[PDB]
Design an enzyme around this catalytic site. Structure first.
Site, mmCIF file in Angstrom:
data_model
loop_
_atom_site.group_PDB
_atom_site.id
_atom_site.type_symbol
_atom_site.label_atom_id
_atom_site.label_comp_id
_atom_site.label_asym_id
_atom_site.label_seq_id
_atom_site.Cartn_x
_atom_site.Cartn_y
_atom_site.Cartn_z
ATOM 1 N N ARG A 1 56.232 28.591 5.408
ATOM 2 C CA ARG A 1 57.007 29.431 4.503
ATOM 3 C C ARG A 1 58.446 28.917 4.428
ATOM 4 N NH1 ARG A 1 60.558 34.027 6.035
ATOM 5 N NH2 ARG A 1 61.038 35.230 4.120
ATOM 6 N N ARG B 1 73.183 39.211 -0.662
ATOM 7 C CA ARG B 1 73.301 38.312 0.480
ATOM 8 C C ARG B 1 74.764 38.072 0.798
ATOM 9 N NH1 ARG B 1 68.777 36.666 3.877
ATOM 10 N NH2 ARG B 1 67.049 37.674 2.745
ATOM 11 N N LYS C 1 55.770 40.967 -2.468
ATOM 12 C CA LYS C 1 56.314 41.539 -1.244
ATOM 13 C C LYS C 1 56.730 42.982 -1.500
ATOM 14 C CE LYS C 1 59.146 38.806 0.926
ATOM 15 N NZ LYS C 1 60.403 38.020 1.060
ATOM 16 N N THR D 1 57.272 40.098 9.870
ATOM 17 C CA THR D 1 58.637 40.390 10.315
ATOM 18 C C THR D 1 58.707 41.107 11.660
ATOM 19 O OG1 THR D 1 59.378 40.558 8.005
ATOM 20 C CG2 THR D 1 60.896 41.315 9.692
HETATM 21 N N1 LIG Z 1 66.057 27.478 5.538
HETATM 22 C C1 LIG Z 1 66.814 28.046 6.512
HETATM 23 N N2 LIG Z 1 67.996 27.531 6.888
HETATM 24 C C2 LIG Z 1 68.756 28.095 7.841
HETATM 25 N N3 LIG Z 1 68.415 29.201 8.518
HETATM 26 C C3 LIG Z 1 67.261 29.816 8.219
HETATM 27 C C4 LIG Z 1 66.367 29.271 7.194
HETATM 28 N N4 LIG Z 1 65.284 30.075 7.121
HETATM 29 C C5 LIG Z 1 65.484 31.052 8.045
HETATM 30 N N5 LIG Z 1 66.659 30.886 8.694
HETATM 31 C C6 LIG Z 1 67.253 31.719 9.773
HETATM 32 O O1 LIG Z 1 66.270 32.554 10.375
HETATM 33 C C7 LIG Z 1 66.561 33.941 10.141
HETATM 34 C C8 LIG Z 1 65.246 34.695 9.949
HETATM 35 O O2 LIG Z 1 64.458 33.985 8.978
HETATM 36 P P1 LIG Z 1 63.931 34.810 7.704
HETATM 37 O O3 LIG Z 1 63.288 36.119 8.146
HETATM 38 O O4 LIG Z 1 63.094 33.896 6.867
HETATM 39 O O5 LIG Z 1 65.309 35.119 6.935
HETATM 40 P P2 LIG Z 1 65.860 36.527 6.305
HETATM 41 O O6 LIG Z 1 65.357 37.661 7.133
HETATM 42 O O7 LIG Z 1 67.348 36.307 6.511
HETATM 43 O O8 LIG Z 1 65.353 36.562 4.902
HETATM 44 C C9 LIG Z 1 67.408 33.889 8.859
HETATM 45 O O9 LIG Z 1 68.229 35.054 8.673
HETATM 46 C C10 LIG Z 1 68.240 32.649 9.088
HETATM 47 O O10 LIG Z 1 69.253 32.933 10.058
HETATM 48 K K LIG Z 2 63.625 35.735 0.639
HETATM 49 MN MN LIG Z 3 62.919 40.963 2.505
HETATM 50 MN MN LIG Z 4 63.314 38.097 7.621
#
Ligand SMILES: Nc1ncnc2c1ncn2[C@@H]1O[C@H](COP(=O)(O)OP(=O)(O)O)[C@@H](O)[C@H]1O
Ligand SMILES: [K+]
Ligand SMILES: [Mn+2]
Ligand SMILES: [Mn+2]
Ligand SMILES: C/C(=C\P(=O)(O)O)C(=O)O
Ligand SMILES: C/C(=C\P(=O)(O)O)C(=O)O
Ligand SMILES: [K+]
Ligand SMILES: [K+]
Ligand SMILES: [Mn+2]
Ligand SMILES: [Mn+2]
Ligand SMILES: [Mn+2]
Lengths: 519, 506, 522
Positions: free
Chosen positions: A61, A108, A258, A316
């Site tokens: 993902r 964001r 989602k 999550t």
């Molecule tokens: N492509 C990415 N580059 C940098 N950090 C990332 C990336 N994907 C995820 N993360 C880090 O991991 C955390 C949790 O991932 P995710 O649940 O996918 O993001 P969010 O909850 O912020 O949508 C993110 O808030 C970010 O800090």
């Molecule tokens: K997203």
């Molecule tokens: Mn979300």
């Molecule tokens: Mn997340």
């Protein structure tokens, strides 16, 4: 002691089924629940991705709420490089799907100190200024926080709460200015970059599909992703817009909607009808609605997806503590187990693999828990109740699927082998929830990758030429599944498997079912 | 939208029940799952304890793995002071139970050092190293260790955070920051330590002097361990409930004989998930809760249910689902440990368990649960089970707002709770200890009656029923003209509640 | 004594319907009490006082007076004999059994005319021959194998080409080939000898005959004068027919129960509105099997009984249940099976017609219904039945239902020997019977008509209290409960130290039995 919780399987009531669960009943080798891993700073090197694949990752993902196109394009190439490094052994090769997770109508924050991975600690009671001034977009820190919703001052007032990062940090608005909010940190925590912002109840006005969404969806098509996880779907019309953007070229990309706010839950039925599958997006959902109600939404949604035969992902914080610890909490073990028992086709890791210190251990833990909980399902009742739910349909492939699963229960077959090109025949089998693994053999490589969305489909790519005689071509593909299951330890010579094939090349579903011994 | 998940309640299948669950169907005000809170530095002040009671705490757990008798006596005193500060109003007073959690046959070790993966660590039983522990020689207090561990087996230290393998001479399989007096587990070892040490006897006798309501007994492996605790508590301690903590493989294997001998059970998941593979704990949890439900004996789900709230004011999504699924599983009580003993957000942790429990309670599939419970006990023809079943059945049919039960031993009320009504059970008793121990049972809202006994039986019954009526109105469980089920004894010597009435609230 | 087999209690414990059937045990002994009410048609074979005394002792609960035949004087005397025979037992209040009187109406009919002017003449109708039906009164005494007159002037409005016409209890069947304004050209499908003044049936037609004939109106008023307990109303096709019967019975007859007889296609199709308007139902299988194909009757029987069970309204299975016992002292195997399956289906009552009205073995027929009913009652699958009845009624939150459900549930759990129910209108005991305990329901009442009407309900054993009202309510309640205690002991339903469920009102004014106790028999 009967393996695979087969003593509990014979129970008459749910209570007795529960009372028979046995910690000394060994699960089988096959693991049916798909594992989806968010790829990011901690997991995007080719070498780590190779080990991710070996530990059980089925779907990569990419979260477009973070990074740039170039960042995610490089992540994706590394996913494909790692995946293809195993292609030299087609018996052992595992297809790996690529999923694009959209921004959608969200708020964001910006970059902490010009970095997508930097963090600062917020102290309880300290002051924090939110600004709309783009001069600070890449200059967020413990004093100044930028965010991208230009209208925020019109939807919050003094006294309002602003939540950052799925409710982790609560900010109380103390003063308002023309393009800023002076807040007090109500609780301490670490603030990173590009974090989601939730203003529960407030009238946030954002389009279903933004201009950035259009550019990301188009990039998804260019990159040949297998599926899109469409964030913050609120009604069927939103799904339709996404499908329109994906267009003719992207018509076979699966759209997973989602569910993450009240409206998506209240309009769930029309959203499911329009989508190819669903993610229970608990991160946002659990700060958008009362956290004590999320489990209601989760079981409702998983159940209704099971009923429709459409894939559903639980997502999550499933193993959140493993971002920093090499073993999960007891509530986290319970959460993964219960999501599998609820009926989730796939489970997912987010921070655990995207940025944590223990990404492989998190993948390995989802694999172990999923196998235990799969055996602990009450398959006999589940099948009866799914059959009841679908009984208005007299569909012929559903009939073959129910007949095959029923046969697989009666003779405790070690697998169902399904020959499929669109995947549909294998999807209909998965939907009726055998306990044995479904080895789906296909010459369509995208079908193989997308099959990971479905509980228990273990896809296998056939790279052999099409044989002139249909009967020999069928056998070649069945025998490929035979060699895969032997190599993986799903079964051995003399076990019994169910085999689903098309009678003639022109059959448009697997209308032929056999019980055959493994050679 | 029907409240209380009543649309889902009328489903024909489990799948349909789940598909009908509705985030917009409001739960009832009453909350049926008991909340057990460990009291420690963060929560032992009188002022914080008062809020814990307001927030929904029913049982105060004292953990004797740590602290002195003087420390715990003062904690218990403050619990009682906070509890009695509400006694002015008998309509609103909540009884609060006191539980003593034994140390048991724990294994502990003797600043900080670091153990790194592959490094070789020596485990000494030589008492000279009792206080000379570093990353090369570690002293532990189990002196029979070398007779019960084979070469190659695993040794776990510090809540399972470190792992070693006996080559004792060991190799660190995964290391960390090693401290003093850290827990040690030997899974797959036949540990022969006694279930009751002399320290445990001191603590148990102290519990008798402090008038505790219940003991949570650690590391129960067999029925004989329970019998030994019962022996130690003795004649003076004979009405103290013994709750056996299941927390190793042998306790799971011998569970049936343990349940038979115990008053109730704790699923002690912390140690359990070190002693057996963590991915199996949910199998043990659901087996044990189900078998306790069958027997009608209290079962507690424990440990890390809201762990992240030690530092955060809101829980993770897994913690929300864990509390909800323990309630759906059938747990009579849920517990908090560090979350209330030492964390930053003890009141919020209590409040979150209260909120989740109410929602999960409505989402139970009561019609099927009742049928299956009735099925499992059908070899019994017991008269009070018959009264209980008829009363819960009637409460489902008319959607009664509560069942009022007059009880002195609590037994009548326990049998009602065992058959799992959705309405609260208001149990009126003159036995103060019965009131406190009733928190062990799903849905019993104990009410202490302080009024003298009336000469006329009918009038004394009416007095106690009207006290439950006043409680339920004050707490918002029902209002005038709602309907309740009332269970009483026909005569003073009836021996159980043999009389059931459907009664309108006055 | 866990090894003594009684009441099919091993099958009671099965998990599935198949395993329940596999556990049925010819050596598992039934209890003494027989719950299914027995309704007997009284006639020349059963009419004398002395024969009626024996009918009552053999198990009769309801005497059916069939007004299709006989004058009012004849019926007054039958009714008189029933009451003489019933009251000859009134000197022992502990053993006295109430006995209800039912009036079964003739109802509207369709009749043919005279063959060649003669009551005794006949003509042969041949399969494939042509036969013309006419309404021209010129032919009403000139019927023959070519012209058949009948007295239903609207017949041409309710049948069509291709419709069937049945003559003489389905003996002859005719297919309409052509239709005119006042005639039908038919072809003979099933031939036979056609006599004079025979009954006609119109399968599938919406017959628009009045709900009651003029004879019925006089009979119904006669029944009010005779103080009958219930009316079996013939040929009920819609709720409007029931309302008409209720209208005729009027204010004076407002407490008489109306049991609608379902006899034709329309009544089955409109069953739901008929049930709602009626006090109960009779599955009138004889005429129904003329009206609809005989191989379909069991479908209508099981549907009607099931839907009556769901509503808590009494249902009777009727007709040819023990037919061969008109001439033989033992029934056929099909007949034993029929009675048993009617009880398993859920029927509150079973009935005898020719077997008691005119046969050679009226007493033996009553006794055999009692024996079969007791065996089949234990063979019911009460646990599943109660769960399914509770599911079907779950939209009602009615308080008396809640008491009844709780009371039956308790009676299952502790294997109580009986439920004692104090009632004046019958309603509290009716609600208990609805939820199908296996144990008998002793319903104590001071209302004699309530006691007689209670026989319509499965398992209700009514007891008349003749003692004056006590001034202390607790004493009056205790008096009635103790009467039930003495009845159950004398009848062998239970003995000192068995357990019973007791349903009473808490105060004189409580309005239903809001109080349930588990009580040891003294
Ligand atoms: N492509 C990415 N580059 C940098 N950090 C990332 C990336 N994907 C995820 N993360 C880090 O991991 C955390 C949790 O991932 P995710 O649940 O996918 O993001 P969010 O909850 O912020 O949508 C993110 O808030 C970010 O800090
Ligand atoms: K997203
Ligand atoms: Mn979300
Ligand atoms: Mn997340
Ligand atoms: C509760 C419990 C016992 P302790 O916290 O005393 O080790 C556990 O292991 O879960
Ligand atoms: C009893 C009955 C109806 P009728 O009394 O009209 O013959 C029947 O045919 O079963
Ligand atoms: K302890
Ligand atoms: K008649
Ligand atoms: Mn422990
Ligand atoms: Mn007839
Ligand atoms: Mn008729």
């Amino acid at each position: 002691i009967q393996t695979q919780q087969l003593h509990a399987a014979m129970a008459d009531t749910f209570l007795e089924h529960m009372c028979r669960l046995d910690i000394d009943s060994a699960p089988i080798t096959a693991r049916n629940t798909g594992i989806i891993c968010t790829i990011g700073p901690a997991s995007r090197s080719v070498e780590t991705l190779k080990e991710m694949i070996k530990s059980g990752m089925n779907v990569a993902r990419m979260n477009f709420s973070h990074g740039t196109h170039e960042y995610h394009a490089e992540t994706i190439k590394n996913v494909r490089t790692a995946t293809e490094s195993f292609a030299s052994d087609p018996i052992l090769y595992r297809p790996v799907a690529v999923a694009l997770d959209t921004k959608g109508p969200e708020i964001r924050t910006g970059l902490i100190k010009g970095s997508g991975t930097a963090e600062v600690e917020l102290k309880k009671g300290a002051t924090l200024k939110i600004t709309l001034d783009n001069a600070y977009m890449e200059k967020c820190d413990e004093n100044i926080l930028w965010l991208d919703y230009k209208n925020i001052c019109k939807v919050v007032d003094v006294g309002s709460k602003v939540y950052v990062d799925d409710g982790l940090i609560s900010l109380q608005v103390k003063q308002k200015g023309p393009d800023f909010l002076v807040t007090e940190v109500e609780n301490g925590g670490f603030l990173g970059s590009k974090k989601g912002v939730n203003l529960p109840g407030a009238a946030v006005d954002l389009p279903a599909v933004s201009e950035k969404d259009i550019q990301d969806l188009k990039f998804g098509v260019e990159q040949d992703v297998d599926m899109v996880f469409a964030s913050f779907i609120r009604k069927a019309a939103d799904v339709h817009e996404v499908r329109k953007i994906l267009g003719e070229k992207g018509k076979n990309i699966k759209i997973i909607s989602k569910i993450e706010n009240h409206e998506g839950v209240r309009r769930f039925d029309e959203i499911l009808e329009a989508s190819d599958g669903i993610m229970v997006a608990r991160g946002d959902l659990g700060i958008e609605i009362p956290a004590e109600k999320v489990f209601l939404a989760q079981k409702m949604i998983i159940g209704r997806c099971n009923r429709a035969g459409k894939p559903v992902i639980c997502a999550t914080q499933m193993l959140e503590s493993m971002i920093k610890k090499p073993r999960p909490t007891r509530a986290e073990g319970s959460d993964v187990a219960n999501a599998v028992l609820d009926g989730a086709d796939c489970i997912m890791l987010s921070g655990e693999t995207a940025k944590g210190d223990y990404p492989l251990e998190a993948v390995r833990m989802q694999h172990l828990i999923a196998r235990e909980a799969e055996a602990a399902m009450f398959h006999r009742k589940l099948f009866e109740e799914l059959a009841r739910a679908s009984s208005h349909s007299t569909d012929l492939m559903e009939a073959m699927a129910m007949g095959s699963v029923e046969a697989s229960y009666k003779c405790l077959a070690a697998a169902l082998i399904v020959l499929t090109e669109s995947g549909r025949s294998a999807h209909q089998v998965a939907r009726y929830r055998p306990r044995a693994p479904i080895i789906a053999v296909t010459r369509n490589h995208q079908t193989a990758r997308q099959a990971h969305l479905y509980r228990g489909i273990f896809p296998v790519v056939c790279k052999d030429p099409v044989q002139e005689a249909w009967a020999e071509d069928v056998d070649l593909r069945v025998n490929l599944a035979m060699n895969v299951g032997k190599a993986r330890g799903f079964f051995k010579k003399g076990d019994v498997v169910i085999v689903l094939t098309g009678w003639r090349p022109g059959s448009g579903f697997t209308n032929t079912m056999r019980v055959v011994p493994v050679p």
